[PDB]
Amino acid sequence: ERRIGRLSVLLLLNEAEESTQVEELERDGWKVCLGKVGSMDAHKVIAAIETASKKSGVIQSEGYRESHALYHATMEALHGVTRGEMLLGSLLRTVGLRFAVLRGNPYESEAEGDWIAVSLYGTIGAPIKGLEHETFGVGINHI
Amino acid sequence: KERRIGRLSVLLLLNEAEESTQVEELERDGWKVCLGKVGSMDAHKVIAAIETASKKSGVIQSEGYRESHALYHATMEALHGVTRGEMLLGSLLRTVGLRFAVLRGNPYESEAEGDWIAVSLYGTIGAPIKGLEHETFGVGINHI
Amino acid sequence: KERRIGRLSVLLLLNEAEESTQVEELERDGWKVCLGKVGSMDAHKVIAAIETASKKSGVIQSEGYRESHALYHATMEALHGVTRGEMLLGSLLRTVGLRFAVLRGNPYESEAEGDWIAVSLYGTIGAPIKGLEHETFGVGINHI
Amino acid sequence: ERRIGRLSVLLLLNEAEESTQVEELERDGWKVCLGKVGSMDAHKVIAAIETASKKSGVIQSEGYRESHALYHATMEALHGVTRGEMLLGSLLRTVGLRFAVLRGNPYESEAEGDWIAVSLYGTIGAPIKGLEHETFGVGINHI
Amino acid sequence: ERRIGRLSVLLLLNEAEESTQVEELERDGWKVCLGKVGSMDAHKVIAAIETASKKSGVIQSEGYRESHALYHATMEALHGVTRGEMLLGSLLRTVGLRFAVLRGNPYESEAEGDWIAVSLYGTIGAPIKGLEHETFGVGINHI
Amino acid sequence: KERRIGRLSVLLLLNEAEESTQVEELERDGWKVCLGKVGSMDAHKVIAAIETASKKSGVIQSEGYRESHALYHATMEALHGVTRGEMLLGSLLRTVGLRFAVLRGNPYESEAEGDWIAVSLYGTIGAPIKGLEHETFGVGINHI
C-alpha cells in the first residue's frame, strides 16, 4: 500500500497513538509532519504549515521547487476544508485545523521522483454546541 | 474521534479490510452503513447509484423527496471535491473507479436535533500517460 | 429605474405575462426587443439561436461582424453567469430549458455616445434527483 | 409561483412601493431583507449583508449552518455582480449595491426544508457620467 | 500578421532593441506599453500596470469601460504567471515581472472596435541561484 | 535571454519562419527540439501526440516512466493554460488547431543539477460567431 493520498488522510484521522504510525512510515522511507492551527485562512494555514514542514525534515529551507509543490498541495486541500469559497475560511472564527504532511516516492522509487501530500481535517465548533461541522481536504503534488 | 459521522465515514471508506466487522460494529451503535462502487465519474451515474444503494438498504427511506434531497446535497458536495481542477481537464475515456461510503445517523452529543447524512467518495483516475494514477477524495455532510 | 437597459432587460425576462403589452410599450420608446427560448445549454446552440432571433427581428442587422460581435460578447458573459460552478458538474442529459431576452437601444441620458445591447437569460436545470430543479440566471451587457 | 430565485430578483429590481411587495411575501411565509452598500468588496458586502439579515429575522444570531448557507448564497451572487474576477470588485470605487435576501420553503413546505437566495443589483457610476454599468447576481442555497 | 496575442508576447520576450519594435507597432496604429514590477501580487501588478497604461496613451484617464477590459486582460495573464493559485503570487518574495500591453484593431479596423492584451513574463530567482523558474501569462480582451 | 528554456521555447513556438535555421541553431547548443501540431484540444489527444513527437525524436527516451512523467506534467500545466475560463464553456465542434513546441536541455548556469523539459502550446479557437477566433497560450516547465 503505497498510496501517498490514502496514507496521509489515514494518518490525519487516526488518533491511535500517532507516534507509532509516524515512525512506521518514517521507517518506511517517508517524511512525515503533523500539526494544528486555529484558522482556515489561506495565509495562516500556509505559514503555519510551511514552518512545521521545514522544522521537521519535510522540505529544504531554501528551495523554490519544493515550496511550490507544498504550497500547491496545501491550496488543493484548502479548497476542500473550506467547502468551496476558500475566502470564506477567513470569516470563520472559532475553528480548528489538523494537518498532516507526507513526502516520498509513491512508485517504489523506480525511475521516479518524490511526491507530496497535505491532509486537512477541519472542525467548526461553537461556544455552546461543541462541534457544528467537519471538513476534509487533500492536496497531492509531485516535486 | 468520539462520534463524528464525517471522520467515521472517512475511516470507513479508507479501510477496506474486514468491512463486515467494522460495519456491524457501526450499526451496533445506532448507525446506518452503506457502501458501494462506481465505475463512473459522471454526476448522474454517481447520484443514481448512491441514490439506490442508500435507499436499497434502509439508509434512507423512499417516500418524500426530503431524505432523497439531504442525500443529494451531501453527494453533490462530496462529488465537487472529487472533481476539482486538475481533474477539470480530464474527460476522455478516463478510467474512473469510484469507491463510496454513506453513513446515516445522529452525531448525538446531548442536543439530538435530528439525523445527519455523510457521503464520502474515494476513487482513482488513470492518466493518459502509462503507469500514472490520480487519487480523488470528496466528502459531503448534510443534516437530513 | 429610469432607462437602464439591464434592469429593463431583466424585468422583461422575469415577467412573462402580457409580453406584447410590455414589449410594445418598450419599442414605443426607441427600443429593440427580442425574446425566445432555448432547450439547450450549449454555448453554440445558444449563441446560434440568439444570433438568429436577434437578427431575424431587426435587433441587429446582418452586414458587418461588428454588431454580430457586440452581441456575442453580451451573450457569452450572460452565458458565463448561467453556467457557474455547481452547474459545472451537471452535463448528462440535463433537462435544460432556457428563456432569453435581448434588448437593443441607448440608455440615453444626454451624452448619447452610441447604442447598447443587453442579453439576459433565465432557465431551469433538472437535477438527477426527483422533484428537484435549479434556477440559472445570467446577464450580458455590451456597447455596440 | 414559488421560485425563490425569480422572486428575489423581481424584488430587488422592483422599486414599486417595495414596502407592499415585502409584506406580500412575508404574509406568504417568507423571510425578506433589503439593503444597500457602497462597495463590491467581498468582505464589505458579506458583513453588510450578514447584519441586515440577522437584524431582520432572516437568520438566527448564532448558528453555523444558516450563516454558511447565507455566505455561500452571497458568494454566488458576488461572482456575478463582479463580472468574473470577484477580486476586482475591490478596486472599483464609486459603486453601489442593492441586495435582497429571501428565505423560505420553495416546495410548498411538503416534506422539505428551507432554502435561501441573495439577489445583488450593482451599478457602477462615475462623477461626471451618471452610471457606466449595471451588474446582476444571484446566489441560491438550501439551509 | 495582426495577432494582438502573438505580437505582445513576442514584444515582451524580445530584448532586441525593443525601442524599435515599439515604434514599429506604434507606426502600425498600435498603443504600446512596457514595464516591470517586483511582485506577483494581484494588487501590486494591476496598480503598477494601470499607471504605465494611463501615462502612455494606452487608456483614457477616466473611463470604466477601458479599465475593466485592462483589469480583466491582466487577471487572465495573472492566473498564468502564477501557476494556478493567483493568491500564491503574494507569498513569493524575490521575484520580478516584465509586462507588455498592446491595444488596437485586430481585424484591420473593418467594422470592428479595439481590443487589448497583457503579456506577463515572470521569473523567480533566489539570492544564491540566479533564477529558479519562468512563468508566462496572456490576457486578451475586447474594449 | 541567455539560456532560459521557457523563453527560448516560447520564442520558438511563436516564430514559424525558417524553423530549421532556428532549430539547428538550438541543437547546436546542447538542446533537444521537437515541434508539431494538434487539431485537438482534448487532454488525451494532446498528451498522446506530444508524448509521441517528443519520444519519436530523441527528446525523451522510452524506458522508465520518469521521463514520460516529467513531460506529462510540463504538458498538463501548459495545457491548463490553454484551457482557462472563457474557454471553459466552448466545447462544441470548436475548431481547435494547436501548434506546440517541446524543448529539452539544461538551463546550465554553473550548478548543472539536471535537465529540464519545457512544453509550450499556442493554438487558435474558432468561435460560433463568424469572423471570430481566440488565441490560446500555455507553457509548462518541469525538471526531469
Curated annotation (Swiss-Prot), chains B, C, F:
Changing R3A: Decrease in binding affinity for mRNA. Transmembrane segments: none annotated. One of its GO terms (molecular function) is mRNA binding. Disulfide bonds: none annotated. The keyword Metal-binding does not apply. Keywords: Activator, Histidine metabolism, RNA-binding, Transcription, Transcription regulation. Changing R3K: Slight decrease in binding affinity for mRNA. Changing R4P: Great decrease in binding affinity for mRNA. Gene3D superfamilies: Hut operon regulatory protein HutP (3.40.1510.10). GO terms for biological process: L-histidine metabolic process; positive regulation of gene expression. The keyword Transcription regulation applies. HAMAP family: HutP. Homohexamer. Antiterminator that binds to cis-acting regulatory sequences on the mRNA in the presence of histidine, thereby suppressing transcription termination and activating the hut operon for histidine utilization. Belongs to the HutP family. This is Hut operon positive regulatory protein. The gene is hutP.
